[PDB]
Design a protein around this ligand. Structure first.
Ligand SMILES: CO[C@@H](c1ccc(C(C)C)cc1)c1nc2ccc(C(=O)O)cc2[nH]1
Length: 157
């Protein structure tokens, strides 16, 4: 079953990244951006329900959100795997880019901006406070740039 309690799970899924990012060590510097950004997504959605009783618009919106809830599985899941030491180099060397959750963060912004329009019309929540609007990938590359360099010189674990 998926009662009202689910509302707390969906929002928690995105929060899990915040703590998961702390677990990392090497690429932890890069993931830090993914966890800080993702937090701003379920931030308003979490506090919302906190305001009063079960806060949720029409069911039609549930469908759009269903796509976002899964978006977290991508980041969270990836973090669990990346947690390893060799796995990091595996992708790093098997990817011209430097960021680990590059493609992941990409969809994250889409799943958010996709439901945002529905959230702004459904609920009185001021979406896109300031952090949104511009792709967070641009800045993500900066961190990954230096993060990748340091990785070059990593013998021990
Ligand atoms: C995936 O969508 C979630 C959801 C999560 C967060 C939000 C914030 C407040 C915008 C809104 C909606 C959701 N929609 C629902 C509709 C009905 C019921 C019900 O009790 O029958 C439960 C629901 N859960």
């Amino acid at each position: 079953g998926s009662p009202g309690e689910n509302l707390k799970h969906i929002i928690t899924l995105g929060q899990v990244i915040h703590k998961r990012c702390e677990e990392m060590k090497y690429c932890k510097k890069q993931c830090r951006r993914l966890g800080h950004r993702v937090l701003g997504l379920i931030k308003p959605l979490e506090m919302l329900q906190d305001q009063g009783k079960r806060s949720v618009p029409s069911e039609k919106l549930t469908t759009a959100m269903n796509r976002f809830k899964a978006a977290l599985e991508e980041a969270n899941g990836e973090i669990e795997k990346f947690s390893n030491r060799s796995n990091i180099c595996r992708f790093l060397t098997a990817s011209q880019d430097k960021i680990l959750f590059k493609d992941v963060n990409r969809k994250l912004s889409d799943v958010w901006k996709e439901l945002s329009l529905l959230l702004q019309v459904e609920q009185r929540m001021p979406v896109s406070p300031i952090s949104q609007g511009a792709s967070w990938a641009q800045e993500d590359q900066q961190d990954a740039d230096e993060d990748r360099r340091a990785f070059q010189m990593l013998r021990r674990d």
